[PDB]
From a paper:
The tightest binding UbV (UbV3) was chosen for further study and was found to block both polyprotein cleavage and DUB activity of PRO in vitro. X-ray structures of UbV3 in isolation and bound to PRO reveal that the inhibitor exists as a dimer that binds two copies of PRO. UbV3 blocked polyprotein cleavage activity that is essential for TYMV replication, and also, DUB activity that usurps cellular Ub-dependent antiviral mechanisms.
G10 is located in a loop between strands β1 and β2 of Ub, and its substitution to valine or alanine destabilizes the β1-β2 loop, causing strand β1 to engage with strands β2 and β5 of another UbV3 monomer to form a stable dimer with β1 strands exchanged. An X-ray structure of UbV3 revealed that it indeed forms a dimeric structure, as suggested from the chromatography studies. Strand β1 of each UbV3 monomer was exchanged to form hydrogen bonds with strand β2 and strand β5 of the partnering UbV3 monomer within the dimer. The extended loops between strands β1 and β2 that link the monomers together do not show any appreciable interactions with each other, suggesting structural flexibility in this region. There are 7 amino acid substitutions in UbV3 with respect to WT Ub (F4L, K6R, L8P, T9F, G10V, K11Q, T12F). Just downstream of strand β1, L8 substituted to proline in UbV3, where the proline has a cis-peptide bond that enables the backbone atoms to adopt similar positions to that found for the T7-L8 peptide bond of Ub. However, the backbone dihedral angles of F9 of UbV3 were changed dramatically (φ = -83.1°, ψ = 141.3°), compared to that of T9 (φ = -101.4°, ψ = 14.9°) in WT Ub, and those of V10 in UbV3 were also changed (φ = -92.3°, ψ = 129.3°) compared to G10 (φ = 77.4°, φ = 16.5°) of WT Ub. These angular changes reflect the change of the β1-β2 loop from a type I β-turn in WT Ub to an extension that reaches out to engage with the partnering monomer in the UbV3 dimer. Indeed, the pyrrolidine ring of P8 and aromatic ring of F9 are ~3 Å apart and appear to form a C-H/π interaction that places the F9 sidechain in an orientation that helps stabilize the extended conformation of the β1-β2 loop along with the G10V substitution to form the UbV3 dimer.
Numbering used by the authors:
A (entry chain B): 0 to 73
B (entry chain A): 0 to 74
């Protein structure tokens, strides 16, 4: 009869299957396919560095189960 | 070739279809069905009150599109 919302404290992770040769831009494209956030609204942070679109995951020592941080850019 | 995880700042809401006569116990059961969180691990908080299992949504004047807060209750 009525809709209510329950705000949860749960943290969302985007889980992606990637190759070490994938560029940061390719990862942003995958995030866009999953979430509809354009690449230019995405900052990907790893180990205190904003990752550059043209570099690869392997360049940054990103390994299996590494956690990146997505921060939106308005 | 490998799994990676991208942590996001996005807030998750559980959307429930409920009746004013539903008890808080009924609401917690619905959350369990959707998310596998047992009722004893759920605190539901609204308007500065922890909602009691035996009382109804109507008892709390919870209306359409009210945003309850789920706070996990663990030992």
């Amino acid at each position: 009869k009525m809709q209510i919302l329950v705000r949860t404290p749960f943290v969302q992770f985007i889980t992606l299957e990637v190759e070490p040769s994938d560029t940061i831009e390719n990862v942003k494209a995958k995030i866009q396919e999953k979430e509809g956030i354009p690449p230019d609204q995405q900052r990907l942070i790893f180990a205190g560095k904003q990752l550059e679109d043209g570099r690869t995951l392997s360049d940054y020592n990103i390994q299996k189960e590494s956690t990146l941080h997505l921060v939106l850019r308005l």
